Each structure stands twice: as C-alpha cells, then as structure tokens.
Design a protein around this nucleic acid. Structure first.
Lengths: 411, 959, 417
DNA sequence: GGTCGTGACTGGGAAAACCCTGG
DNA sequence: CCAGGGTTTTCCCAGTCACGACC
C-alpha cells in the first residue's frame, strides 16, 4: 500500500494529479469522481488520445469521424439510468406551492421524468443515429466505422459515504468505435480488432505482460471479449468489445427496413454492430502506474510523454545565455517538440536536485547552457534512461531529438 | 522709454537691448532714401497699416567681447577653434613614416615602429589622427579593423570578432565592442580627420558617453563638397560624360564624392585600387580571418589617400572660407547625439507587425483576384476579357530527357513491405527529365513570373510576389476610369481606352489625349493626369495623388465595391515604412550600461533599473550639399508624426534619459526673411524697403496685408494657390510653369487668357525688365536683383560670412548656365551660415555659464539641445539670447544698424522629453493606436515664449 | 439569402454539418442546439482548435493547460439559474416506493434542490479552482496563464417551436484563457491580447475586413472588448475579453490573503484576472461563410469552391486512378496513400471508389470538399514516375515527380501559415 | 529648388545545359 | 563512343523611371 500512496504523492507533487490528498481517492480515481488532472496529466491525456486517434481513424479508410452531442433530449424510454437534466426553477415553484396533493406531485414527477433530458452514458447510442448519413458517405459500401474520442458521465454510488441519498456524478473520457460490418465475417473482424488493440496497448508499456484479454458473452448470447490491465491492487476494465448484433439498428428505425440495409458485395443486408470502448483516463492512470519503479523516475514512453526536453542556464552572464536559450526554444517549438522553459527560474538548486525534479516529471532529456557553450557550442545533455551526461553540438540538438522520437515510435 | 521706431514705423529693439548690442550711434539713413522708399511703397499701396505694438523687452546681456558684433563673433570663433586648427596644421605639416611591413595579429590596438617593430599600446596618444574603420556587415555592425595614422607612426587595431572565434555574440551592441580612441583626463582636445568620418565616428567608444567629452571631427568629403562639389544634375552629367549645353570646363574642376575620384581630382597620380573581391560587403568572418594582410593593406591605402586629400586640401578650404565661424560651426554639426531608452525594441516590433499585417491583407486581396484569373485560360476566355487580354497566355511543355474479408497479421506486414518497396521503386525513375527544375509550367505566362521558384529559401505558397506597383496589378483588379477600361503603354504611361474609333479624336470626350501614335484600333489612348504636369507619364495608379479620385466617383475599382478605396488606403498606410524599414532597422545602438551612466541619472526617481537606456550616433555629412547643408540618410528624411503612416513616430521614440530634458526651437520664415533682408540692404538699408520685405516682417496674416494673401488678391485665386506660386517663384520658376499650374487649378480658364493672367501675376510680383538690364517696378525686384548680383559675380561669397561658392559653379566655368542653382545657392548658403552662427553662439554661451548642455541634432533650421532637468529654462534663455545675437549679427553684416523687435526672440523654445513638432501633439500612430502617454507614458512638454522665459528666469544667466 | 441557402445546402450535402433542413436554421446553428456536425465538420473544428492551441499555448512559455470538470457539484450559491443534475436511480426509488408521503416528497425535492450539481455555463469559475496549484507550478512567478478548450452548456429560449414549455439545452465549444496579471499591467495585457486575438482571427480569413473589434464596458465599469464577424445578416459575437479585476479571485478564497499573493519581480500582489473566451462553433460557421464567395463582380464566375485556409481545410489531398492495370496502379496508389499519411497529411481514399465519374464531376466534388490538391495516378505514372496535381485555387494541371510530392505538400502546409 | 532612399522593369552579358557532328 | 562548336536558355546585375520621406 505504501508504494501506491508514494506514487500518488509523486503525481500530486509534480502536477499530474490535482487536488488535496484526501480528495485523491483510489476509488475516486477509478470511478471518475476525481477533481481533475494536473496540466501534465492534461498533456498526457492529449498524447494518449493522439496515439489512439492515429492508430484507429487516420490509417483506415472505412473509419470516419462522428460528433454526438453530450445530451439526449426527451422523451426517453422508462428505466433509463442516466442522470436526468432538471431545471431548478420548476422544482422550486412546485416546492413553494403545497396545494397539490401527494398523487398530483407523483403525476408531475412522472411527467417531468418522461420529459427530462439526459447526459449520455456511452457514445454507442449517439453513433447509431449517424448510421444513415455515414453509410451514405461510403456509397453504401460496407464495412465502415465511426469513432469519437470524448467524455461521458456515469453514476457513482459510494456505499462508504451516502447518508441523505447523496449520489455523486462521475465523468470519464472514453474512445469509441462502432464498426458496422456484414454478418458473414463478423467474428473475424472481432478477432482482428481485438488483437490489434492488445498490440496497441502493449506498444507503449514498459512491461507489456501485465496486459491481458478475456472472453465473455451477454445474456442474449452476443459474443464478447474484454481487456484488463493489472494494477497493483488488481485487474480493472480498460476496454470492452461486444458483438452487438442488429437489435439496436432495427429498433432505431422501425419503418422502411430496407433503408437501413448495407451493401455487402452484390447484396443488401442489415450490418452487424461491433462496439469498442475503453477508458482513456483509466488507461492514463494505468500507464502512470506502470512507469513507477524503485531513484523515483517516471519512464513514460517517449511518444506519449508530456515534456520531451528541458532547458536550464548555468553559471555565467544571464543575458547571453537567456538569448541563446530563447532562440533554441523557438526553434524546437517550430519543429513540433514540446519543451519545458526552465531557463527562467533563478533558484540555485543543486544540479542533482534539479535532475531529480525533472526526472520525476518524466522528461526525456535535459539541456543546460553554460559559459563553455558560448565558448565552443556544446550543450550538456542528460539521458533520463542512462543517468549519463553527454555533450552535443547545440546546432544538432533538434535533429538528435526528432530522431530519438521517431526511433522510439518505430520500436 | 524702451519703445522706439524706425523711419518706416516698425517696432525695433528696446533702448537697453539696442544700446548693449549696437554700441552707440550710427550713420542713420538719409531723407532721400526715405523719400524714394516711401514713394515706392505708396506706388504699390501697402503703406500705413499699423499693428498692435509688441511688448517692450528688457535684458542685460553677459559681457560682449570685442568692440563690435563681428569682432565679438570672431574672437569667440578663435577661442573655439584654437586647438583644433593647431592640431590640423600639426598633422598637415608632418613627415609620414613608411608603411608597416606586415600587419600584426593582436586584439585591440598595436603600435608599429619605424623599422617595423610592433608593440600593443593600450590607447593611441596622439593629438591628431586619420581613421578608417572596417565593418563586417554579415556578423553584425560591430567594427572589425582599425588602422590609424599619426605624426609618430601608423597604428593598428583589430576587433575581438576577428581574433577569437566564440559560438555567439550579443545582438545588441555594448560599449565594450568599440575602439578606445580618446584622451583620458600635455594637451586637450583632439581632431580625427577622415573620409565620411560620420561612418567612422559611430564606432568610437567614448562618443557614446552622454557626459560629452572634448573631441571634434572633419570630413574630407565635406571639404570637397564645399570646395569643388557638384549638384545632382551636375553629378549625373559628370558621370555620363565620363562614360561618354556648353561651358564644359566644370568637367575638369570637380568630381563625385568617392575617395578615388577625389584623389584623382586633388593629387591625381596612380588611380587607387578597388579590391574587387569586396569581402567586407559580402563575406564570412573566417574568410576575413584568412585574408587579413590584403584587407588591412587596402584599409591603410584608404588612410593614406584620405591623408593626401586632407593635406592637399586644407589650405584651399581656408583660402575660400576665410571666416573662422564657418569652420567652427562645421565642427559642431558633426557631434550629434540622440538618446534612446528601452522602448526601441518594442517600437521595431510594433512597426514590423503592423506593416506585416497590412501587407498580408493587401496581398491576399490581390491574390484572390489573381487565382480567379487563371480560370479564363481554358476555352480561350482570355480574348474577350477587356483588361486581361494582352498578358501572356502561353503554356509550357513538361520537358523530359464482391464480398470482403479481414487480413492476417503476416499478410498485413507483407502487404505493407510490398507497397513500400513498390513506392520506392518509382522514386528511382529520376534518371530523366531536366536536372535543373522547371518553374510552374502550364500556368499562363503572366502567372509564372509572379510566383517564386521553389529553389528560393523564403518561398511561400501562391502568387506572393504581388505588390500594388506591378504593371499587371491594375488590370488584375480591372480599374475603369469614368467607365472606360484602363491600359498601359510605355510611350505614354498609364491611361484609359475609350471605344469608338472606326479606324482620330473622340466624339464625346475630352482629356489628356487622344494620342494616335499608340494604336490599338477601335479605341483611343488618353492619359491620366499627374501632379507634375502633362509632360510626365502616370507611373502607378495606386498613388497618393489619386486618393481624392477614389471617392469622387471618377475612379472605380471595377472588380469590387469597397476593396479599391481600401487598397489605396493601405497603400498610403505602409508607403513610408516600405522605404524606411531598411535604414530605420539598420541603425546602431550602444546601450550604455548602468556603470557608465551619470550619477544624477541613476539618482533620479524616474530611473528604471530593469530598463535599458542607450543612444544612437547619427551619421551626418556636415557638408554633403552644394549649399553646404548636412546630409543624413535617415534622420534628415524621417517622417515627423502622422496618424496614418506606420512607423511615423520614429522621431518621437528619441527620448531623453531620466534627469534630462530636450530644449529646442525652429527658425521662422527663414528663407523669406533672408530674401527680404537682402533686398532691404540692397535698396536703402532700411527694413521694409520692399513690399516683399514688409510682408515678410510686418505682414498682417490675420487681417489685411500679408505676402501669401496679397498675391492671391491680385490674381483673384485661392490663398493656397497663391502660397504655392510664391514658394515656386522664390525657388525660381518661369511663366510657362505659372500658366500650366493656373490651367490645372481651374479648367474653366482658357490658355488664351491663362497666359495673360500668368504674365500679369508675375509682373505684379517680380516685375518687368527694362534695359539700362535688371528687375524694376516689381514688388520683389530688389531682392531678385541683389541675388543675381551676388550670383553672377566672379567670386560669389556668401553675403553673411563670405564662404565662396563651390568652384564648379564659378561664372568663369559655367557662364550663362545653371543660373537657378546658383541663385538658390545664395539664399540656402546664407541659411547654412546662419545655422553655423547659431551653433557657435550656443556653444560659447553654454560654456560661459557652466551650463551642462549637449547637442541633439541640427535639422537645417531646427536646433535641439539636450540639457539637464534643473536648469531647463536657463537653456531656454541661452537659446533666446543666441537668437537675438545671431539675428543682430546677420543684420550688421549687410550693414543695417537696427533690428526689429518682432524677430528679436524665438517664438516657442520647446521643452519636452521626446522630439516632435509640437509639445502638445500625442501623435497617435497606426503602430501606436492608443498614444504616447499610454504606450510609453511621456507627458506633454511645456512651450515657452520670451516673456515667459524672462519671467521664469528673472532675465539672468547665472544660477 | 440565396448565397447563404446555397452554402447551407453544400455544407449539408458534402457532409460538413449533420442533420435535416428543418434543424438547419440560422437560429439553431447560432444557439448551440443544431443536430450536430458532419465528419468533415468535425475535422474542420479539430483543425481550428489545433491552430488556436498552437498559437495560444504552444508559443507561450508562461501558459499551461487546465482541465475543468464538466459539472460543478453542489451546494451552490442561491439564485443560480443553472440546471440541476439528478440521478435516475434516486427518482426510480422515489417513484417505486409507495410508502412515501406528500410531505416526504416535498422534503425530498427540497433536499435535491439544496444538494444538486450544475452543468458548466462558463469555464472561468472552474478555472480559478486550480489557481493555487498552478501558481505553485510557476514558482510564484506572475504573470501566468491557464487555457482550456471544451464545450459549455447554455440555455435556449424560443417562442414558436416550444409548445409544452420545453426549455432546450444548448452546447457550444469554447476556448477560454485566464490570464493573471499585475494591476499595473491591466490595460497593457488587455490591449495586447485583444490585438493578438484579432490578428489570429484575421490570419486564416480570406477577407479579413469582415472581422472587427469593438470596445465595451460592463455595468461595473471594468474594461472589455468584443469581436464580431459580418455575416450576410449582421455581426455575431465571436469572442469576448473582460478585465475581471480581483472580485472573483478574492471571493473564491476569502479565507486568507497571504496564500493568493503573486510576485511581480520583488513585490507581492493580489493579481487581476483577464478572461478571454471565444466562440469556436460560430467561428467555424463564419469561416465557412468567408470561404464561399458571395458573387453579386464578373458575371462569368461559376465553380462554387470553398477557399478555406490550407492549414484549416479538413482533407489536404485526394487520389484517383485513370486507365491502366488496376492491380499495379492500386498498389502505387496505396503506397502513395501510406506515404502521405506518414507525414501528417490527411488524404482522401478516392482510389477505392469504383464509380467511373467524369473528370469534371470529380473535380467539382473534390472542390466542394475544399480539397487543396487533386492527385491523379495514370499509366504514365507507372511508366516514369510523373504524377498530376490540380491546385484548388488555380485549377491548372501540372506534373511533378512522385517522390517530390511529399516535400512539396509539407512545405506548402507549413509555409501557408 | 536640393536630397535621400527604394522598387519594378529591362537589356546585355555570363554561366550552365543540349546535337551531332567524327576519328 | 564522348569532347567539343555552336545553340539555346536561364540567371544576374547596371542602369532607368516613377514615388514618397524630411527641408
């Protein structure tokens, strides 16, 4: 338990996680009741979403983007468990007037519930409404898929702290994929996507053996597979795969059934729906947990790291070193490398302490400028992975960095 | 009491002031001259109109040396130029040791012995030197090499940028990056002659200290311009004749200002070398490192040539400029100093940003129409376009030398490898096609030249080389003057085509045309009007003079509804900064650190520790004009302040450091006053002898008789036209000019009557010519006669201080040519001598009372001094008494023994913290849309008049 | 209107916006209740967000990203008009239990109102919640800034369509910048940011004159500015800036003043807050309007085209196959497709469609999608390696070597900025 | 009238890429 | 079978004309 608390403390100190220690509950992190992530966490989520989007949407011609609004207006089918969008004005007005009896209040509540909007719990529902037009986009050719990286909302019932029926609201960002495929080869596509996503998740891990897959089947007989990551305290769901069949599509447009058909070869058929859904936030937590090894340094994969290179100014006249550092910083930004502008700080913390601080922040490489740099053009460069200091030509720093990033990407 | 008057009832100087400044007594004018002058004035009917008396002013002056005004001035000038001429003669008559054997390699200064022994001396220790500086512009504007000559031996200096090779250098220059050429506190003061010494001055280390050390300079280029100079037309004709009208002896007694030509004119001998490799203009720091010996030899050759010219020239200059005030003033016009605070960098950023954004707006507005013009090539749609038909519409040829199923992972990898290999296979098919690339074939002929070639390092997509000046830009916008399409011919400039030719003249149009010579059958080619007359072709429709034509409905953008007026509005916005952006951003700044600032500036509360206060040393050619004026590439040509010109606040950015304030003024109607006073001295020696004189001096601009209004009354035209005509006449212009301008200002007057109107107007102003030949009967006949008498003399000296005209303009060589240039030279050179008198008087007065003062800039008439905050009004009183002294001396040289009070003192001695025309204007520029109090927080300065000055200062000069 | 009607027609037809013509009203588009966007529209919004994020956060060393939770849990200040979030499980337990009373229902509704969360109406209030930690991040160096892009929910009022009093919930994606500045530097940074924002919006516009800025003050006299776009029907607010002072900052943490002091050099002050928020969706519609020419000068100007800025156009290049061996040409096209994908260039897989559409029809279709270039691989391409390129703005056909396409495209996209 | 920059255009010369000649 | 004589094309630089800045 100490290691988990130590890692949480590290992420809180270095602006990965935001909020106070009590507000940083492991259950809150898992269930989406967290107060938010630090700016480094924001960059980490951005990189994770970038890699997911690149691996899914960019490289495959049958996937097109889809945008579903965060709500669904009424009326809604009874029994839905989503948070009901409620206007406080009507509730206050009903509270003020007590002339209505108990039965009248029940009737009003039922009417409002039948007419209350809801926050989406999974993008799957929204994507189906886009099946018609997005099907038209590929000239009725199947298969084709939709994807939308985004956030949803889920109820949380914390049995530990509920006294006055207080149910919290959890928000989790999930990446979705709705693969409309002909029934003939559905499970082959399922296996393809499953293996691909296992490979993708293992790609950026330090110890990929901790990722695993498992099979499942619903109550209605739909075949499914689920991915789990081995957190220190146990395995937690990180992505789910289901063979939804055609129940939803047929339910959605109950009239001209032919209009929802898809052209598979020379025939028109109703496609099968495949669902891919994983918690990108929980995956970010998973990668952070993976990166912890006992020198406490976060070795996030270079392609997902938030900060790629850091700059500092050594002993010597301030103005010249600062001008050189600003020039290098601008050049690096212009070429698509995220940098940390540490050259402004004046605190004379030791080089060892500064190295520890930057490493704890998951920084790939450290560049320091001193008088000798103005003398000859070599900048001190520290390797996060090797604890070795290398001196390199200041002109050739950017090429070395971009080569390192690409080489990590292709490995 | 103090009030007095002249025989023409003009308020002259007060009794105390006149007694102090005019001795006692004088040969007052006779009654005969009075009667003649009165008869003249009555004949023109400008006699009697009185004016509200100006208040009497009393002032007891500091002791005036000598026993006369001229003697006092000459004694002061001798005091001022006593050491400098001594050093100049010491250097002129001195043995020059042999050239060094081989130039050494050590940072900084190095002394070269008679036999070639080299010793690094910390600083030069000689009273006089001739200096040549070398700048490697590629690696910044820091100076690189210095070879110095002196009576003892040659001296050599090399920058650190050549000796040691660091990784990088500061882009903002520091005082440590200059040459230690000064005498720190057996002699005092030093003189460093040189060629274009202003260029050499800017790299001297101590000339950036605001404390103002004692040193002066002499530009041999200035001497050559003053001695055997050439005008712009003269210089052009000299160059043309050398490459290959009468009285061509002047081709043998003058040349251009390059060092080699001056060497040929003065000492001749072998033509000087040139070093065609031009390493300094274009090169590399390592390259200059490797080729040290040859480059330093060329620098020393330049030094030797400059010394030869100076030595063979200095006696001649005094032989033609025998007034010490002239040399003394020439010393003080070359010590300009301008302080600049941390606001310089922000100024450059804002100016560049605004220019860039407006440029982008204009360019995209043009590019949108450009791209859409390509779509007229298919189907031969270019032919019917009324505007885009004659452009090049020729292309270029490219030169040449079901079901489904998923996939297996192994199959996917194999397919990826196969596709990559197949792609890489085609990449090797380069073994054909031109090795040198083609530049956008297929696009029409006009389009390809607009776009840049991909080999360009700074390439940007699309036709990005479009500016409003291009000859295809107007057609690309399809401008139609009065509903007639435009057209361009190189035989008659721009113009519009009117359809209706059946093969002539228009049936229903009038204008500048038609010109049947340029024939595009079916139409006629008229000509757009210009501001320089019909003899000039209109060069660019997007010009300032067409701004009224944008709104009046005469000019229509054609392919727009509002872009056109916006187009010419953007044109006028960035016109100035377009030209000025190079030299404005090419200036040098030496940001003096806190260590070398004065103690008081640091002690001042408004001092900023984080801020950087620096200075710029202008490069001014003291005599670069035939009229012996100053020449400065930027500051003499800097836009003052406007709310529609980007970067127009450049002058306002020149700001005093903490603890200092600028004090300045500006002469009033200087050219007209000099003309009037010369005419008065020529007629009877009484002010207001001529009608022009009275209008200049006592003219009532508010109500009644004044120079600008009275001419309008005679002609019957608008006052502005009369003012323009009068300025043209004093510049010198003929009757055809007048008739053309009259026909321009009004199209309702026919030439048949316009000629008579012009001749009558000139007769009223200047008068006719009877033969005794001279000017008589005209309101300004006396001044014109006096000017031509001075000009046509064998040895025309300036009327004031007697500096002879440039020998290339002597009548013995030009005879009856270049009359206008000489007659203008008279007035303008008098003005330059007047500025010299002002400067020498100011220098003496500031030295007399221990006033901590310095020179800012001498913008021709204007004078600005930089003085400390506490004694701000004392400097104002010094300036006012200087003005009084110099105007009294000016009158006395012509011989008049009295001076009117109305000119006896400056109108507004402005005290301010940033140079601008008025202390009141905030000059909200398009680059500073808010204002100076909001962008840089300067207050509005205080402007003071003579009565306010004497009241605040109690009329005393001591503390 | 006819030009606007045509533009809306095109945006629906080529899948820029999603939904039916009844939902595609101007009020629906502006109010945040449109049925959604088409895939190309999502790409366009992503590109605009990327450009904004680069120009605001990437090229500022003192600005850091912030994430605001989409809902604000209670209890909230009284008088808030925001909607309340209620779990369906609680309502189900309330309605199913028959033992409840009228008084119990009233107490339950009072408890719900007193202890309910709200959707975010603006990003500012949540942004300030991270001020202490973010201030610690920059070693107490003022100024510093927090940025965030995301969707905010606003109410919508209507009179014709609203039959049964149904108030609609509208969503809009907002880019918000919180800039904490010393009081001496209030109007300095305010004007600087106004200038930077106006330049940023004018930079990608085809006709920047339609963009404008206007100064306006709040009821409390604090300085602000509003930027607009000249739609065919009038200006619409696309971005606002306010000088909030410190009232919100002092109210957020009223406990102690010593925790919230910021350093401006050597002096500790409580800083003033400048809030910059812009309307991404309105700006996207505005750039769509700007790209389409409202031809009303040359009478012979056909070919409806969408001149989006190249850094904002959704799909960079498109591929096609001519006459020749289908398999080898398809291999070539797939190779080129992968090559252009590897370099950050979006490519439209046009070589997979089997329709034998005429070349003019295909040029029109790719133009309506605002495709920068049209690349054609034919038999000659396999012969020698020469490929065709039809520039959107020029419509002129040129040929380049197939290995020279990657560098040309990358240089084009980069230098277009 | 004098003085200074500039830019767009242009003509002529210099540098670099082709034809088929033939031993 | 390739080096060149003569050919052509393209690149560059001096000069020219119109323009807009202080006097």
């Amino acid at each position: 338990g100490e290691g988990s608390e130590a890692l949480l403390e590290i992420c809180q100190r270095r602006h990965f996680l935001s909020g106070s220690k009590q507000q940083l509950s492991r259950d809150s992190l898992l269930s989406g009741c967290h107060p938010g992530f630090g700016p480094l966490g924001v960059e980490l989520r951005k990189n994770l979403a970038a890699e997911w989007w690149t691996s899914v949407v960019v490289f495959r011609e049958q996937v097109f983007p889809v945008d579903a609004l965060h709500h669904k207006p009424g009326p809604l089918l009874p029994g839905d468990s989503a948070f009901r969008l409620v206007s406080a004005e009507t509730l206050r007005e009903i509270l003020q007037d007590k002339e209505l009896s108990k039965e009248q209040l029940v009737a009003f509540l039922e009417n409002v519930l039948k007419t209350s909007g809801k926050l989406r719990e999974n993008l799957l529902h929204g994507a189906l409404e886009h099946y018609v037009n997005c099907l038209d986009l590929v000239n009725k050719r199947l298969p084709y898929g939709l994807a939308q990286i985004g956030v949803c909302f889920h109820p949380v019932f914390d049995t530990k702290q509920i006294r006055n029926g207080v149910k919290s609201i959890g928000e989790k960002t999930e990446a979705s994929l709705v693969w409309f495929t002909p029934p003939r080869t559905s499970n082959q596509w399922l296996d393809f996507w499953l293996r691909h996503r296992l490979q993708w998740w293992r790609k950026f891990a330090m110890s990929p053996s901790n990722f695993s897959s498992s099979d499942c089947q619903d109550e209605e007989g739909r075949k499914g597979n689920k991915l789990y990551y081995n957190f220190p305290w146990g395995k937690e769901l990180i992505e789910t795969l289901w063979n939804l069949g055609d129940h939803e599509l047929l339910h959605m447009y109950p009239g001209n059934v032919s209009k929802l058909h898809g052209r598979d070869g020379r025939k028109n058929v109703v496609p099968c729906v495949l669902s891919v859904n994983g918690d990108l936030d929980r995956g970010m937590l998973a990668y952070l947990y993976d990166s912890f090894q006992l020198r406490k340094v976060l070795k996030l994969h270079p392609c997902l790291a938030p900060i790629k290179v850091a700059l500092d100014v050594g002993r010597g006249p301030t103005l010249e070193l600062r001008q050189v550092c600003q020039g290098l910083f601008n050049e690096l930004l212009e070429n698509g490398i995220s940098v940390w502008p540490g050259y402004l700080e004046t605190m004379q913390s030791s080089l060892e302490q500064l190295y520890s601080k930057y490493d704890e922040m998951s920084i790939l490489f450290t560049v320091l400028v001193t008088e000798t740099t103005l003398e000859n053009g070599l900048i001190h460069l520290r390797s996060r992975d090797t604890t070795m200091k290398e001196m390199m030509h200041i002109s050739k720093l950017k090429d070395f960095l971009i080569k390192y990033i690409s080489s990590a990407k292709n490995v | 009491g103090q009030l007095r008057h002249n025989p023409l009832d003009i308020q002259m100087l007060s009794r105390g002031l006149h007694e102090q400044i005019f001795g006692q007594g004088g040969e007052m004018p006779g009654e005969a001259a009075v009667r003649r002058s009165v008869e003249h004035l009555q004949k023109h009917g400008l006699w009697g109109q009185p004016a509200v008396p100006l208040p009497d002013v009393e002032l007891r002056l500091p002791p005036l040396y000598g026993d006369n005004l001229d003697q006092h001035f000459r004694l002061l000038a001798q005091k001022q130029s006593l050491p400098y001429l001594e050093a100049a003669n010491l250097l002129l008559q001195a043995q020059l040791p042999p050239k060094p054997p081989a130039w050494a390699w050590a940072e900084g200064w190095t002394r070269y012995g008679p036999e070639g022994e080299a010793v690094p001396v910390a600083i030069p220790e000689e009273r006089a030197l001739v200096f040549a500086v070398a700048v490697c512009l590629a690696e910044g504007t820091c100076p690189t090499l210095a070879v110095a000559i002196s009576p003892s031996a040659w001296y050599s200096w090399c920058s650190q940028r050549l000796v040691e090779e660091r990784y990088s250098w500061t882009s903002q220059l520091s005082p440590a990056d200059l040459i230690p050429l000064e005498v720190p506190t057996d002699w005092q003061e030093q003189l460093v002659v040189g060629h274009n010494v202003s260029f050499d001055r800017a790299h001297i280390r101590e000339q950036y200290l605001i404390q103002g050390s004692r040193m002066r300079f002499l530009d041999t280029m200035s001497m050559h311009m003053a001695i055997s100079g050439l005008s712009s037309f003269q210089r052009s004709l000299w160059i043309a004749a050398k490459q290959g009208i009468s009285s061509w002896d002047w081709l043998d007694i003058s040349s251009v200002n390059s060092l080699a030509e001056v060497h040929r004119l003065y000492v001749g001998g072998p033509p000087l070398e040139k070093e065609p490799r031009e390493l300094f203009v274009k090169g590399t720091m390592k390259d200059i490192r490797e080729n040290f010996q040859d480059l330093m030899q060329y620098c020393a050759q330049d030094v030797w040539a400059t010394h030869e010219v100076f030595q063979q020239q200095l006696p001649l200059f005094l032989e033609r400029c025998p007034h010490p005030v002239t040399l003394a003033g020439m010393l003080e016009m070359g010590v300009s100093y301008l302080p600049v605070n941390q606001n310089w960098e922000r100024y450059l950023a804002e100016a560049q940003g605004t220019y860039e954004e407006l440029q982008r707006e204009m360019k995209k507005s043009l590019m949108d129409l450009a791209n859409d013009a390509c779509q007229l090539l298919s189907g031969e749609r270019y032919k019917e376009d009324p505007w885009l038909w004659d452009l090049e519409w020729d292309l270029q040829e490219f030169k040449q030398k079901e079901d489904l199923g998923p996939c297996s992972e192994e199959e996917e990898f194999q397919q990826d490898v196969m596709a990559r290999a197949c792609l890489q296979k085609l990449k090797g098919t380069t073994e054909l096609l031109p090795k040198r690339p083609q530049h956008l074939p297929g696009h029409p002929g006009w389009y390809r030249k607009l776009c840049p070639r991909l080999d360009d390092p700074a390439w940007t997509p699309g036709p990005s080389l479009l500016s409003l000046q291009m000859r295809v830009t107007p057609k690309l916008m399809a401008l139609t003057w009065d509903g007639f399409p435009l057209h361009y011919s190189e035989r008659h400039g721009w113009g519009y085509l009117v359809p209706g030719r059946r093969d002539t003249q228009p049936s229903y149009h009038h204008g500048n045309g038609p010109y049947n010579d340029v024939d595009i059958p079916g139409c006629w080619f008229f000509k757009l009007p210009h501001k320089d007359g019909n003899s000039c072709n209109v060069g660019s429709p997007f010009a300032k003079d067409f701004l009224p034509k944008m709104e009046d409905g005469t000019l229509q953008a054609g392919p727009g509804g509002a872009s056109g007026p916006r187009a010419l509005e953007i044109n006028k916005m960035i016109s100035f900064w377009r030209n000025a952006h190079k030299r404005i951003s090419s200036q040098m700044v030496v940001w003096l650190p806190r260590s070398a600032l004065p103690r008081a500036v640091i002690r001042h509360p408004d001092y900023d520790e984080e801020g950087l206060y620096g200075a710029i040393l202008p490069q001014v050619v003291t005599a670069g004009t035939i009229t012996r004026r100053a020449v400065e590439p930027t500051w003499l040509t800097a836009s003052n302040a406007r709310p529609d010109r980007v970067g127009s606040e450049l002058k306002a950015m020149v700001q005093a450091p903490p603890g200092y304030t600028l004090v300045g003024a500006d002469v009033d109607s200087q050219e007209l006053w000099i003309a009037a006073v010369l005419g008065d001295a020529h007629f009877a020696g009484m002010h207001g002898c001529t009608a022009f004189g009275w209008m200049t001096l006592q003219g009532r601009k508010s109500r009644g008789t004044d120079l600008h209004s009275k001419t309008a009354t005679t002609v019957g035209i608008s006052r502005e036209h009369a003012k323009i005509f009068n300025y043209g006449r004093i510049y010198g212009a003929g009757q055809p000019f007048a008739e053309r301008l009259l026909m321009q200002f009004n199209h309702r007057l026919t030439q048949q009557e316009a000629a008579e109107k012009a001749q009558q107007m000139y007769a009223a102003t200047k008068g006719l010519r009877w033969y005794r030949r001279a000017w008589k009967g005209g309101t300004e006949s006396e001044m014109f006669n006096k000017l031509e008498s001075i000009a046509t003399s064998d040895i025309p000296r300036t009327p004031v201080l007697g500096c002879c005209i440039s020998r290339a303009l002597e009548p013995s060589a030009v005879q009856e040519e270049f009359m206008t240039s000489r007659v203008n030279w008279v007035v303008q050179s008098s003005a330059v001598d007047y500025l010299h008198l002002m400067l020498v008087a100011m220098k003496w007065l500031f030295e007399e009372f221990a006033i901590d003062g310095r020179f800012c800039i001498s913008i021709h008439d204007e004078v600005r001094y930089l003085v400390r905050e506490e004694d701000r009004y004392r400097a104002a009183l010094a300036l006012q008494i200087t003005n009084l002294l110099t105007r009294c001396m000016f009158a006395y040289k012509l011989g008049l023994n009295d001076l009117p009070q109305s000119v006896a003192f400056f109108s507004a001695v402005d005290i301010d913290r940033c140079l601008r025309k008025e202390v009141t204007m905030d000059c909200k520029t398009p680059s500073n849309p808010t204002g100076m109090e909001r962008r840089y927080g300067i207050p509005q300065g205080e402007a003071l008049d003579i009565y306010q000055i004497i009241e605040l200062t109690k009329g005393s000069l001591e503390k």
